[PDB]
Structure 1
């Protein structure tokens, strides 16, 4: 019952500063333009202790599965090879990615009927709001 309020299928409804976030992370121009245009569906599910997050769009379809607090190796949609740990902190899913001595944090929060995603790198924040599909 750890992530009950996050489970379901979610669709992007608004975005702010996403280009700038992608630039901070090091994403190249063509990828930023195509990924920025994406309208992803985020599908979150839980089976026992294993959480699965899928992100589907015309840009890329990705899937991660994990156990809270347990590190994994992930290839991101922009093809970074990162070491990721996802934890629950005060009801917020906190996803930290480390690679090449850099770090970024992606927080997912339930706020009213929305799932709000905040992506942060070096003072550059992007806010992505999803609603139930």
Structure 2
């Protein structure tokens, strides 16, 4: 079939987090923004419309939103308000999302396992891991 939609679409609520503070520090996020973002526990809404995929994150603190095609690079404004250039691909059924800015790079992987959606953020060997369930 064409199973990528059925795997990822829906509304996901955070249920665990590792070293997110550390990840945000390494990306350069300010100390107050880090803490408040860490407490926000935002939902992640994934949707599909033909070739165009969208990932919304919603909290009382801040909303964000990206729409993209796989393989196409696009400008993105991140939750801490960095301007970045992003490319998202489907590699072995995982969504792999790369962010380039000022000669740096961070990678965000989103992978389904069982009833869960696991997100891994890497920045120069600081690694954060967050788990989500359907809400």
Deviation, structure 1 residue 41: 0.6
Q: Which residue of structure 2 aligns with residue 3 of structure 1?
A: 5
State the alpha-carbon separation in 2 of the partners of residues 57 and 43 from structure 1. 11
Q: Which residue of structure 1 aligns with residue 48 of structure 2?
A: 46
Point out the more displaced range, 19-28 or 2-11.
Answer: 2-11
Q: Which residue of structure 2 aligns with residue 124 of structure 1?
A: 126
SS of the equivalent of 1:60 reads coil
Structure 1: stretches of 5+ with no match in the other structure: none
State the alpha-carbon separation in 2 of the partners of residues 2 and 107 from structure 1. 14
RMSD of aligned alpha carbons:
0.7
State the alpha-carbon separation in 1 of the partners of residues 20 and 61 from structure 2. 15
SS of the equivalent of 1:36 reads helix
Q: Which residue of structure 2 aligns with residue 16 of structure 1?
A: 18
Deviation, structure 1 residue 43: 0.4
Q: How many residues align?
A: 133
SS of the equivalent of 1:77 reads coil
Deviation, structure 1 residue 58: 1.8
Deviation, structure 1 residue 14: 0.5
Deviation, structure 1 residue 63: 0.7
State the alpha-carbon separation in 1 of the partners of residues 29 and 102 from structure 2. 14
Extract structure 1 runs of 4+ deviating beyond 6 A: none
Taking structure 2 as the reference length, the TM-score comes to 0.96
Deviation, structure 1 residue 106: 0.2
| Structure (1 or 2) with the greater helix fraction | 2
What are the equivalent positions in structure 2 for 1:65-104 lying under 5 Å apart? 65-104=67-106
Taking structure 1 as the reference length, the TM-score comes to 0.98
Deviation, structure 1 residue 4: 2.1
